[PDB]
Structure formats: C-alpha cells, structure tokens
Amino acid sequence: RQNIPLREILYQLSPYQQDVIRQTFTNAPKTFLRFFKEKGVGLATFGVLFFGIKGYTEHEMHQERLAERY
Amino acid sequence: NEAADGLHAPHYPWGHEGVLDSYDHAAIRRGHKVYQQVCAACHSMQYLHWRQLVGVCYTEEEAKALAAETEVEDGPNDEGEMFTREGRLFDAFPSPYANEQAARYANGGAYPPDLTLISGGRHNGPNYIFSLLTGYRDPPAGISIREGLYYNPYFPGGAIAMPKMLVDGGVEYEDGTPASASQQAKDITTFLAWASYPYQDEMRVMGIKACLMISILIGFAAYSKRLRWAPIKSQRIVMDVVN
Amino acid sequence: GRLFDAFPSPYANEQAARYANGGAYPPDLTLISGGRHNGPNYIFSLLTGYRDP
Amino acid sequence: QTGGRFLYASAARLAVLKIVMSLSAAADTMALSSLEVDLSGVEEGTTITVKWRGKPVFIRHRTDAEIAQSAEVALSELRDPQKDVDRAINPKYLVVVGICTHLGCVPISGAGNYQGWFCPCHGSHYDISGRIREGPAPYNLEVPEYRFTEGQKVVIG
Amino acid sequence: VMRLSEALYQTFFKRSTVYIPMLLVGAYFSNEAIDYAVDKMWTTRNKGKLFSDIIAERT
Amino acid sequence: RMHNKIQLLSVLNTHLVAYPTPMNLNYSWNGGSLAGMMLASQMLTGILLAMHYVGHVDYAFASVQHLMTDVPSGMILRYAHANGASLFFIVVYLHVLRGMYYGSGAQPREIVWISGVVILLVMIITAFIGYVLPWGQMSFWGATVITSLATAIPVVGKHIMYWLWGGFSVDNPTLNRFYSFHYTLPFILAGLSVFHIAALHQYGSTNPLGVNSQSSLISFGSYFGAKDLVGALFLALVFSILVFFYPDLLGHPDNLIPANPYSTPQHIVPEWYFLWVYAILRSIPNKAMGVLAIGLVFASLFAMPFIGLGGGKFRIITEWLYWTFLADVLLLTWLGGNEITPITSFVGQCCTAYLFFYLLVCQPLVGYLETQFAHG
Amino acid sequence: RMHNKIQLLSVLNTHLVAYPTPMNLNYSWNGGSLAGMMLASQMLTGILLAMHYVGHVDYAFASVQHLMTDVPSGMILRYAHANGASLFFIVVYLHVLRGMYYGSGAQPREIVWISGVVILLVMIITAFIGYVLPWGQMSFWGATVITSLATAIPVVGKHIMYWLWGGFSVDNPTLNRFYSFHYTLPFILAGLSVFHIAALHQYGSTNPLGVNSQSSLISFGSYFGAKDLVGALFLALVFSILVFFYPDLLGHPDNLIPANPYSTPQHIVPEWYFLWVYAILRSIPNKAMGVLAIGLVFASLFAMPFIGLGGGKFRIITEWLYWTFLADVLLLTWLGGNEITPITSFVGQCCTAYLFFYLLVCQPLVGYLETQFAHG
Amino acid sequence: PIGVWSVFQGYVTPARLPSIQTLTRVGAWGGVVVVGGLYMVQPWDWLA
Numbered sequence A: 001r002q003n004i005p006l007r008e009i010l011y012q013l014s015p016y017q018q019d020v021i022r023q024t025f026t027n028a029p030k031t032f033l034r035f036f037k038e039k040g041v042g043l044a045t046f047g048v049l050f051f052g053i054k055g056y057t058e059h060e061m062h063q064e065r066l067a068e069r070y
Numbered sequence B: 001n002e003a004a005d006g007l008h009a010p011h012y013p014w015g016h017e018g019v020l021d022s023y024d025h026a027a028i029r030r031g032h033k034v035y036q037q038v039c040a041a042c043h044s045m046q047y048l049h050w051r052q053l054v055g056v057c058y059t060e061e062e063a064k065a066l067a068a069e070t071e072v073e074d075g076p077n078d079e080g081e082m083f084t085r086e087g088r089l090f091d092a093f094p095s096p097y098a099n100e101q102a103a104r105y106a107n108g109g110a111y112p113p114d115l116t117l118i119s120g121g122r123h124n125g126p127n128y129i130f131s132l133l134t135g136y137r138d139p140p141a142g143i144s145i146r147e148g149l150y151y152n153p154y155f156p157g158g159a160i161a162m163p164k165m166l167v168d169g170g171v172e173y174e175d176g177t178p179a180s181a182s183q184q185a186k187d188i189t190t191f192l193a194w195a196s197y198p199y200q201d202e203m204r205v206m207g208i209k210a211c212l213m214i215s216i217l218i219g220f221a222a223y224s225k226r227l228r229w230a231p232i233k234s235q236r237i238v239m240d241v242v243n
Numbered sequence C: 001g002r003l004f005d006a007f008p009s010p011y012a013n014e015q016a017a018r019y020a021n022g023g024a025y026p027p028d029l030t031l032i033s034g035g036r037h038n039g040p041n042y043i044f045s046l047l048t049g050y051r052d053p
Numbered sequence D: 001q002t003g004g005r006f007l008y009a010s011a012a013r014l015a016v017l018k019i020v021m022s023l024s025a026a027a028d029t030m031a032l033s034s035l036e037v038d039l040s041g042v043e044e045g046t047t048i049t050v051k052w053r054g055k056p057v058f059i060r061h062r063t064d065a066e067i068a069q070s071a072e073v074a075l076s077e078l079r080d081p082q083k084d085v086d087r088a089i090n091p092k093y094l095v096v097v098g099i100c101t102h103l104g105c106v107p108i109s110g111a112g113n114y115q116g117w118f119c120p121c122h123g124s125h126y127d128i129s130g131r132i133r134e135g136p137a138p139y140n141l142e143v144p145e146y147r148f149t150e151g152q153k154v155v156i157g
Numbered sequence E: 001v002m003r004l005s006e007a008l009y010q011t012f013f014k015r016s017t018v019y020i021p022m023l024l025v026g027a028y029f030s031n032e033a034i035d036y037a038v039d040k041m042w043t044t045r046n047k048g049k050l051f052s053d054i055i056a057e058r059t
Numbered sequence F, G: 001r002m003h004n005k006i007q008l009l010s011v012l013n014t015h016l017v018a019y020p021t022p023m024n025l026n027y028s029w030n031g032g033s034l035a036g037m038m039l040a041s042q043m044l045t046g047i048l049l050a051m052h053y054v055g056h057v058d059y060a061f062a063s064v065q066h067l068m069t070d071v072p073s074g075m076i077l078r079y080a081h082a083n084g085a086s087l088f089f090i091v092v093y094l095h096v097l098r099g100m101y102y103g104s105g106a107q108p109r110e111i112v113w114i115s116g117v118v119i120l121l122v123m124i125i126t127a128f129i130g131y132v133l134p135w136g137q138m139s140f141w142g143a144t145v146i147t148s149l150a151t152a153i154p155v156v157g158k159h160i161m162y163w164l165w166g167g168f169s170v171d172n173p174t175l176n177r178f179y180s181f182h183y184t185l186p187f188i189l190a191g192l193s194v195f196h197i198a199a200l201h202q203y204g205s206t207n208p209l210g211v212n213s214q215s216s217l218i219s220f221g222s223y224f225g226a227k228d229l230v231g232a233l234f235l236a237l238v239f240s241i242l243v244f245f246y247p248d249l250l251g252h253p254d255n256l257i258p259a260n261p262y263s264t265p266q267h268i269v270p271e272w273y274f275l276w277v278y279a280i281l282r283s284i285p286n287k288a289m290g291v292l293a294i295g296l297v298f299a300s301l302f303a304m305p306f307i308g309l310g311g312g313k314f315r316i317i318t319e320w321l322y323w324t325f326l327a328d329v330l331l332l333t334w335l336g337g338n339e340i341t342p343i344t345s346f347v348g349q350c351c352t353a354y355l356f357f358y359l360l361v362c363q364p365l366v367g368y369l370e371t372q373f374a375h376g
Numbered sequence H: 001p002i003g004v005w006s007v008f009q010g011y012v013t014p015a016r017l018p019s020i021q022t023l024t025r026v027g028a029w030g031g032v033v034v035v036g037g038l039y040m041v042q043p044w045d046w047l048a
C-alpha cells in the first residue's frame, strides 16, 4: 500500500492522559484573530464587490422608479 | 410599476410573532365570530372543519352546537335522492355558493377567494390583511374608479371589488369587548393567521426542545471528537531534516 | 351530445338503480364480458335461458 | 460520554416514533367512527346495511316468528353457543356486524337454508341471529356497542 | 485530575449488557426533565393566552 | 489496454467480458439472466405505467381504463406489465428449482442462496401489493384476507392490523400507501440482484457434472452472450404470445369489477404464483399454525445450505426424490385454486407434510447416506 | 480476520473503517457526508409523503392540505421535505465551491468532477419537477414558463413541447408524468453518488495544503466518523430551526394559492437555488442565446479538469480571483429575484460576462502564469 | 459441509462447544432487547 521511505521517531500519548476541551477556551480569541488575519483580504473584496454592485443597482432602480412619476 | 405593486403595509406588533410566543386564543374566538357574521356571506374557508376548532377555540359541546346550526347536504338515501341534515363535527365549514361561477355572478365578476390559507398566501400576510380591511382611503389625483369597484391602496392595482364590511358595533362579542372596526379587523386577522398555521404553538414547543437537545449534543459530540483526535493533535515527530 | 361525450346513464346513482329494480343493481356492461368466467358463452346462455325451475 | 448517549437514545426514540406514527389513522378517519340511523324508515322483515367503519352492519326488523325461531334454537346445535337474549337487548331490532371471523368475508342476507345469512366464500352459514350453523367459521358474528335513542334512533359506537 | 471511581466502574460500566439498560433509564429521565423545563417555561411566559386558561377562568 | 486506464471499464471488463465461466453449462443456466431481463422489463413498464395511474379510490379503476383505451400503446404497456409478473415468477421458480436440483447453495455459495431467498420474499411482497393497485374485487378482497391475518399473533394483533390499514378497514389510506411501497420495493430488488450476482462472482458457477471446473473455463462475454440471447428470444416469443393473443388468460375475471366492500365474490383466490402458499395456509385448520407453517417453509429454505447434502446426477436417490418434490409443489399449486372440501383438506395436509419431510429429513439424511455409499 | 471471511464485510471494512485519509483535513471536507445525509433525508421523507399525496389535478392541493392538518406528523414531514431540498442545495453548492477553490477536479480526479457535474444536473431536474407537485400558482406557472423554452429550438420546438406536456397546455398528464419522473430520479441520484464516491476512493482526497499526503494517512472510521458527526449536528440545528420556527421563510406565498391557468401572478420567480440560472436566462434578450449560455456554463463546468490550472492557498492570484467569482455568483442569485429593468439587465449581462471570463480566461491563463512564476 | 456435516463427522465434541460462562454472557443479551422494547413502546404498569 504505497511504501513511503522515511526516517522519524513518533511519540503518542493516551487520550486518557491529557485534557479534552480545557485549552479550547484559551485558544479561542487567538484562533478568531488568526482566522480573520488569514481570510481578511478575500472576505473584504467579496463584501466590497457584492455590496457595492448591489447598492449601485438598488440606487439606480430607485432613480428609475422616480423618473416614471408625474 | 408602483401603482401595480400597491402600498406596502407597516409592521404591527403582533403578540404571536416571537418564537417564544403563543397565539391569543381569546382573539381567535372573537375572530371566528367576525367570520360567521361578516365574512362567511361570501367566503368559503373550505379546508376548515368544526373538529379542528375544539381545544383551540371552543369546547366540544360549543362546537357541536355551532355545527348543528348549519344545513349540510347529505346522501344518497335508499331512494337515490339528496337530502339535508344538521352539521356535525366532521363536517366542513359551509360555503356560501355552490361553485365559482355563481360566486363571480354575485360579485360583479370577481371571485372572493378562500380564506383558509390567505394569511400565508400573501406577502406580509397579517399586516397586509389588517391594513386592507382598515384602509379604504380617498383616491389620489388622476386616479378614477369604475362603478362596482372601491379604492384601497393596499390592494395591488388600487381597485378592489370588496366594499367596506367592518363597521363599529357590527359584532356583539360575548366577553364584553367593545367592537370597533379596528378591533374586529385585528381579531379576524388573528383568526386567519391561525387558519394558515394551525399548529404554530406545538411547532414552537417542539422547536424549543429540539434546539436545546441539539445544542447540548453539539457540545457532547465536540467532546467525543476532541477525545478521539487527542493522540494525533499532541504527537511528537522528530526527524533529521532542518532545511 | 357530442363525440367526446360518454354513453348516457339511465339513472343518477347506484341507489336509484336499486330503487327502480327492486333492490338489485344492474351492473355496468362495458367490461361485463371479461368480468365473467367463460364470458360471451355465459352471456348468450343467460340471455336465452329463462326456463322452468 | 454516558451523558451524551442519554440524549442520543432519546433523539433516536423520538425520531423513530415520529416516523411510525404517520401510518396511523388520520384525524378525519378518526372523526368518521360514529353513526346515527333512523329506524322509522325501516320496514319489518327487511334487512338494511349501513357503513359503520367500513364494515357492513345488518339491521333487520325481526318479526315475531323470527324472534320465536331464534329463541327456539338450542345451544347444542350452535358451534359457539350463545342465546338470542345475550346478543341484542331488544329482540325486535338486531344490530349485527357482517364480517366473518374466519377470514373477513361478508354474509348475504335473505339466502341460506336457515332463512338467514349465507357466506359464499367458504360455505359458512349463519342463522337469523348471527350464530354459526355450518362451515369453517369458528366464531359468532360480532354485535357492536350501541344504545337506544328515544326518537327511534340507534347510535353505533 | 478528576477520575471515575473504580467501584462505580465495576458495576455500571464494565459490561455492555448492564451499561445499556442504565443508558435507557437515564435517557427516559433526561427526556422527562427536558419536557418539564420547556413546558414550564412556555406556560409561564404565555399565561392568560392559552385555551386552558380561558376554560379554567370560566369555572 | 484502454480498459486498464478507467476504473469503470476495468470492472465492466472483469465482470462482463473476460469473466471465466465453465464451458459445459447447459440451457438451465440461463435462468438468472432471464430473471434480470424480466426485472428490467417490469421496472420499465411500471415507470411508464405510473405516468397515467392515479393512486386514489374513485379514480384508480377509471385511470386504468383510460390507460387501456386512450393512452397510445397503453394497452400493450398494461398487458406487458401484468403478464411480465407471471413470466418473472416462472423464470425465478425454474431458477430456484435448478438450484434445488444441483445443490447450488452448498459451500462456498451459501451467501448466494441466502440472498436469493431474500430476493424471493421481496418479490412476493412487491407482486402482492402491486396486485392491490388496480382496485378491483380481487385486489380489495385479497388485500383484506391477507392483511387481516395479523390477528394470529397474541395480544399485539389488531393494533398492527389497524396500523397497516391506516384505519379500520382496507380503504383509501391502504391503497395510497401501497402505491408508494410498490413503487419503492423494485429498486431494493435491483440492488439485491446486484449484490446477489456479486456474491456469485467470488467463486464462480457450478457445472452440470458437479465437479471442480477450474481447468476448463472460457470467457463469458463472447460465448455466453449469444447463448443468453437465444433464451431471451424464446422468452420474448412466449411474452409476445401472452400479451397479444391471451392477455387475460392468467388473470381472474372478477378483477374487472370495481371493488365493493359490502359484497364479496364467491371464490377468493390469488394469482397463480401465490397459490402453493395459499394451499399450505388453507389446508391447516388454524390461522396461527398456518402462519407458523408458512414461516417454517422459508426458514427451511434459509437453512438449506447448512442442512442440504446431495446434488445433481451421480447422486441418484436424491435426484429421484427431486421429482417427487416437484410433483408435491405442483399439486399444492393446483389445490390452491379449488374450494375447501374434506378430501382436498386431507390431500393438502399430506402434501404439506411431505414438503416438510423432503426439506428437513430427505435432504440431510438421504444425502449423508449417499456420501457414505459413494465415498465411504 | 472476521471481515476476511465475507465479501460484504471486507468491502465495508476497506471503504469505511480502515480507509486511509489525510490527517490535516479541515471542516471544508465535510460537505460530501452532509450531502449524502441530505439525500437520504430527502428520500425517506419523500417516501413517507408519497403515501398521502395524490397526483391528480383535482386532488393534489387538497391532499397536501389534508396531509398538513390531519395526518399525524404530516406537517413535520412536509416541512422537512420542502426545507431539506433547500439545505441539500446549500450543502451541494458549498461542496462545489470548495472544489472550485482548491482545484480538486485536477488530475487524477477528472472522473470525480465529471460525475459531480452529472449529479448536479440530475439534482436540478429532480427539484424542478418536484416543485410542480403541490400544483400551486408558482408550481403551474414556472413549469409553463420553463418548458416553453423548448420552442426556442426551430422547426421541432413546439412538437417537443407538446410531447413533454401530453397536450396543448400544462395539465393533468404533465402532473402525472412529473410525479413518476420525480419519484424515479432520486434513485438514479443514489446510484450516481455511489459511483462518484467509489471514483474518489481510487486515489483518495486532497488536503488543505495542496501537497502529496501519502506519508500522513489515518483510518477513516475511527477519526472522521466523529468529525462528520459534529457537522451533522450543526446541520441538524439549522434544519430544526427552519422546520419549526420559520417554515415558509425559503418559500413563496403564491404556491399556497391553487393553480389558475387564466390568471398569472405578477412576479413569477423560482426557488432561490435556480435564481442564478434564471438571471443568466433573463439577462440575454434572446431565448436561444440564453439557453446556449446556460449550456455553455455547464460545458465550462465539465471542461474544468482539462482547462483549469491553479489551486489552493499557495497559488495566490487565482485564490484572490476566487472571491470575485463568489461575489459574481451571489450577485447572479440576487438579480434573479428582481424584476426586469434596464439597470438589472445591464448588470446581469456584465455579471454573466464576468462568470464566463473567470471560467474560460482566468483559470487556464492566470494558472499558467502562476505555475511559471512558482516553478519556471 | 458447514452445519449437519460438522456433527456427522464428529467435529462437535464436548470441547469446541461454548462454555457455560459464554452462554450466560450471550444469554444476558435477552434482557437488553426486552428493556429496549419496553423503552420504545412504554406500556407502563401493563403487567396484568
């Protein structure tokens, strides 16, 4: 099953010799900031393009409705 | 076009809007009485039965006495003929007309639609219904209305065939509530909102239980996921590569 | 009537048919030949077989 | 882990019960289990059939000769012995459900050697009172629950 | 740090045929408690609006 | 190779083109491909039928009539779908009798036999609830008689019965759910057929000689494609005769009467392929014992790879006993269409007793005696 | 050892229990299990709803109402089906966007991408013909508008339209054949999903790093079962909220009016998951050109594994252009729900042109430039 | 040759049969299905 040549030492601890969810509270703000640091540019360019084009379209639609008035 | 769209209805503070809130069952009872005395002369509500009003709106005996005051066609008998009888709990609400064509003929060509699902069948349902019932205003400049039609800016197009039907004191409530036009409109709108979603209270109770159970189970499953993945997330690999 | 119309019924329902025939229903004759064992032979014999008991 | 498995078992049971209780009888099916019949439109010596829960119920206005003949039937000849007074409170008015306990067929009134009910499916035979006389039907015809109304009516159920 | 007791382990945890009925009775009582809490909160919030409140009011 | 670069072509090549098959298989090894062809034909005709059928009382009979007289090619589709069930059961029954004759379920092909028995049970349920759908007298009264047989299990009886019916009698909810169950079950049949064929390919097929055939194997896709095509053409001839010349020969005339819950027909019998089980049930004068015997027949069918010793020829006593078993089963098929009579009750009881005797006493004990005679 | 004795245990063990999987898979690799679970949910709730639905134009709406009010748990089943369709489309669209972001269709996984595009087309057709079954105003008029696109094909357009309708207009035969096709196509979806998953197991999954992962593989059953359970519970929360608190949020109020062929609604709109295709169609003032543009969109989706260069995080120019593509498809979704207007026509035309530019110009050429930047 | 052939050949001895402890541990699954059915149906105080 796909022999891989490799030289290493691997260590593993029992899952009943460590904690489960206690470190999740410590790392939660750091992980939040790291997520937004990594995906900040893409989410921002998505938001700018989508909301800008939607806002321009809705504004010009409102102007079109106003132009039909008497 | 704005005139074809009609005037939008404002958002009214209904007491059943929140997911934690039940219906006002006293208002359903008063709304049904507006239905029997004003609505039902020209509206059918063909998917309601007297059995479904029990435990929501009336007791069994009250609903039986209400159903027994209606004439229901039944048959055929042993002589192959059609006869009439007293209504019962399993009977549906009486329709004022036998067919769509006589309903159109009695109303200038316009067919008054069924009201069982008119609340969920319109955009912004209860607010549109209340504003339509209380909103027979004076037409604006340049808008003329033909004979047989009446102005209502909430109706799309602005020219409805339903006249003003709610009047002050036109219903005598049995709980002492004074019956202005707005109170009657609010009660019948509550009854129609119940008619579109008859199990909203039970659905919300089940949804509260389901959301609580799934929210606890999410934490328990996250615990069992992190327990299984712990020997991998904390493993130590040492190799000769530095790069 | 027109070509798309069905064949006219003598009565209005089953109960009037039983009422006009002493409590017995004259069955529909569209699928009566395939509806009986040995169909056309049985129908011919029954039509011409009113004899003494 | 046990605390989570409590809610897992609860959710599994609730989902299974919600799936199963959708083939149960609907509300309009349950509402149509009741019947009122007027006995003024019943002739004497005639059997009428009514739809009580889809089961053909034979109501025959029994004559005094029929009442005497049903009272003259000995319990020894009956495969399942039951007296005529133990079935109907009023011997004149008989309310009998016409379903065979053998397999589920329907007897025919006005036909049979005992001037009663004859079942054509397997040769099962019944008298005027709903009691087995001959054939593979092992049990008597069921009498439903009913009560007499003052206005010559019978409510079944 | 916190650790399951040995005597409580040998009774309700070592065999699956003892663990499963305990699981079912715990599931029953958990469902009862959740039903009670949800129903009490709903009836307290919507007091005076239900049909049973009108019926008990008319007594 | 072109088939070595796409994994779909590799599986298709391995299992349909280059699959090694014994070269001495006769024409009694064409039952399986014919059964698969009949399953595909039934699925196609039914999917076409469901575009004109309405699964409601007071519309079902009229929709079948509108299908028969007004839909272009609708009469062909209905008669093909009706007679295809009969031909499907003919082919599957001959397949099972082949496996009974040759001892085809033995080691290492027990999974093949067990998956076959499961397929047969699903076929029976599918055909019954599909027979209810036209809503005639035979449909209604057969569905009434069979589903009201759950009142043999003590205590939990009529509860299960009323939950099946959706009410208190066979009515519109029963027909409406029977339509959905009948549409759905043939896809389970197709999946079980794929699993059944895949279980056989682990070890390959037996041969008429009953010996190891690993030395003499040939490719499937060239030699056994035309051999299957010949039998398929014979089956198409019989199918065309049944559809076009005798379309109502295998049916019952009472199913052309609209269903009446208050009037029962004189004789209530199922389709012919259900008649042997009906005779077993009707012969025993107890409902619970009849259901127990019906369950015991299928339990003995499941237990056949683990109790059945003895194959085709060169095992001559069990070979001769197979013909008595075939006569017994055909007699039970004939008895199910008759009326209940003391002589027919006695003969049906004797036939059921001999069926159990052959399935549970002859196959282990006579087979062991044959092994002790031949290799002892 | 015990799974070595039965084939079915061995296949299940290999492909579900001991299947090697990259250890660094994040929660973007849960869309496939969620899509499979939503398909199973749709099949179960649809099979249960079919026992109470009647496919006739006189009883369809009425049976829907009766199932809503009178059938026990019928409202839960009906709302679960109608909102599980939307959640199915959400999960599948996020799965496809994951594949577009990481370039997962590339070699050696071209078959996986192609079977995925086939699955998505079958899914679209299944949902469209399922929406016609309630026989409301939107159900009638959307089927009228969409099946009238066949007349854009010259000469033989109206003949294909009348053949699909069964008449001169959308009526009862259309509803009956749509019900049969709608019952049938989910089983083809299940088969296609089995083939699609077995195609991926030939080589394995890609990882978020985009590198070869054969040095770091762990068993699927012990590790990714729990990780899939977590995402299934997050999906069950959203499902519960949509079923119980906002059941008509993702619907239309006009589908609660019975169908009227003599009075059209003012704003005929589809469900939200067909709105981007509808915006592409409405933006072009030519029916044949709109149908061709939709076909070219799906052809560009088929041709992605052979024209697409550029993958995950380390290929940064295409990674930045992905978000522009995502904004474009959501703008197409929003534009479909709005009325025809010169500015919406212009913006829809520009958005369609940008979608074609991204699919056919950015993915080959910018991918080639960044391969030359990184490894030239 | 799995089944009755194993007992005809003498391959099923007093040995190679399950022990009393093995049968009791398997036999303890009888209470689990009873408790599971009673949990699923809940016929409370239905015992006569």
Ligand SMILES: CCCCCCCCCCCCCCCCCC(=O)OC[C@H](COP(=O)(O)O)OC(=O)CCCCCCCCCCCCCCCCC
Binding pocket: A040, A043, A044, A045, A047, A048, A051, A052, A055, A056, A058, A059, A062
């Ligand atoms: C006349 C009708 C009146 C209608 C009034 C209601 C209109 C809609 C509500 C108002 C919407 C405007 C603010 C929306 C804020 C949403 C959040 C957001 O953008 O954050 C995403 C995003 C968050 O990034 P993340 O936190 O990294 O995900 O924020 C940004 O990156 C900033 C986005 C700024 C770009 C949009 C600016 C507004 C466009 C208006 C263009 C007008 C053109 C005029 C041309 C004609 C002149 C004659």
Ligand code: HEC
Binding pocket: G039, G042, G043, G044, G045, G046, G047, G049, G050, G053, G064, G078, G081, G082, G085, G088, G123, G126, G127, G128, G130, G131, G132, G133, G134, G182, G183, G186, G187, G189
């Ligand atoms: C998107 C994928 C999808 C799949 C897969 C699917 N359905 Fe549905 N189905 C729908 C939609 C959409 C509707 C329309 C729901 C609505 O608006 O009421 C629907 C409605 C129905 C209806 C009409 C009842 C009603 O509430 O309108 C039936 C019957 C039905 N589906 C059966 C099935 C069956 C049977 C299966 C599977 C074997 C299935 N469906 C799978 C999407 C799907």
Ligand code: HEC
Binding pocket: F029, F030, F031, F032, F033, F035, F036, F039, F092, F095, F096, F099, F102, F104, F105, F109, F112, F113, F115, F116, F117, F119, F120, F193, F196, F197, F200, F204, F205, F206, F207
């Ligand atoms: C109760 C038994 C049984 C049933 C029912 C059954 N099979 Fe078979 N089938 C077998 C056995 C045993 C074999 C192996 C025969 C041999 O190799 O000697 C077999 C072999 C086959 C073969 C290989 C060719 C052949 O005919 O030997 C095919 C194909 C096949 N089955 C398909 C089907 C299909 C399709 C169905 C039903 C729709 C079906 N079978 C029903 C038991 C059954």
Ligand code: HEC
Binding pocket: F039, F042, F043, F044, F045, F046, F047, F049, F050, F053, F064, F078, F081, F082, F085, F088, F123, F126, F127, F130, F131, F132, F133, F134, F182, F183, F186, F187
């Ligand atoms: C094993 C047998 C079998 C299979 C497989 C089968 N059917 Fe049929 N089905 C029947 C029988 C028998 C009838 C009764 C036909 C009759 O007597 O008119 C029937 C009747 C029907 C009817 C009612 C219309 C009519 O003419 O009776 C429909 C619809 C139908 N089947 C659809 C299907 C569909 C759809 C499938 C598969 C996807 C299918 N059937 C597969 C046996 C089968």
Ligand code: HEC
Binding pocket: G028, G029, G030, G031, G032, G033, G035, G036, G039, G092, G095, G096, G099, G102, G104, G105, G109, G112, G113, G115, G116, G117, G119, G120, G193, G196, G197, G200, G204, G205, G206, G207
């Ligand atoms: C048009 C694309 C597309 C569609 C639609 C699609 N798939 Fe996928 N799917 C992929 C690709 C590509 C992969 C391989 C991605 C990888 O492993 O990095 C994949 C992987 C998977 C996986 C493995 C893990 C994962 O989530 O990536 C599963 C399971 C899966 N698909 C199931 C499904 C099911 C079930 C459906 C629909 C009913 C579906 N897919 C629809 C393209 C698709």
Ligand SMILES: COC1=C(OC)C(=O)C(C/C=C(\C)CC/C=C(/C)CC/C=C(\C)CC/C=C(\C)CCC=C(C)C)=C(C)C1=O
Binding pocket: F124, F125, F128, F129, F131, F138, F139, F141, F142, F143, F145, F146, F147, F164, F178, F181, F268, F269, F270, F271, F274, F277, F278, F281
């Ligand atoms: C005249 O009368 C008769 C019939 O009538 C025409 C018959 O046919 C039969 C033949 C039927 C037999 C032998 C029994 C059929 C087998 C079973 C298990 C009964 C069918 C069970 C049902 C309908 C329960 C509901 C389940 C359904 C619909 C599907 C379940 C779903 C899955 C398994 C996935 C006989 C004997 C009969 O004398």
Ligand SMILES: COC1=C(OC)C(=O)C(C/C=C(\C)CC/C=C(/C)CC/C=C(\C)CC/C=C(\C)CCC=C(C)C)=C(C)C1=O
Binding pocket: F188, G015, G016, G019, G021, G029, G030, G032, G033, G034, G035, G036, G037, G039, G040, G043, G189, G190, G193, G194, G197, G205, G220, G224, G228
């Ligand atoms: C590393 O990558 C992988 C994943 O990602 C993390 C996975 O998640 C999975 C597991 C795959 C899952 C859960 C998807 C579900 C699979 C399919 C093929 C969906 C289609 C199947 C259906 C709808 C079954 C329903 C039909 C039935 C039961 C037949 C009808 C019969 C009856 C009702 C009796 C695998 C193997 C995987 O390798």
Ligand SMILES: COC1=C(OC)C(=O)C(C/C=C(\C)CC/C=C(/C)CC/C=C(\C)CC/C=C(\C)CCC=C(C)C)=C(C)C1=O
Binding pocket: G124, G125, G127, G128, G129, G131, G138, G139, G141, G142, G143, G145, G146, G147, G164, G181, G268, G269, G270, G271, G274, G277, G278, G281
């Ligand atoms: C309210 O309503 C409406 C819908 O609905 C919810 C819609 O979706 C749409 C628009 C949807 C689009 C453009 C995407 C989906 C497009 C198509 C063409 C769906 C495919 C369906 C077709 C062609 C119907 C024909 C059916 C067949 C061929 C059955 C399949 C069987 C076989 C291939 C053998 C609109 C406008 C609509 O207003």
Ligand SMILES: COC1=C(OC)C(=O)C(C/C=C(\C)CC/C=C(\C)CC/C=C(\C)CC/C=C(/C)CCC=C(C)C)=C(C)C1=O
Binding pocket: F021, F025, F029, F030, F032, F033, F034, F035, F036, F037, F040, F197, F205, F220, F224, F228, G188
């Ligand atoms: C002992 O030696 C053997 C035989 O004896 C000589 C056999 O006979 C067979 C099996 C024979 C096979 C597989 C061919 C028979 C056909 C079957 C089972 C299916 C019938 C299907 C037909 C005619 C066409 C179906 C068409 C379509 C489009 C359906 C597919 C659907 C989609 C692609 C969506 C095997 C394996 C064998 O080892």
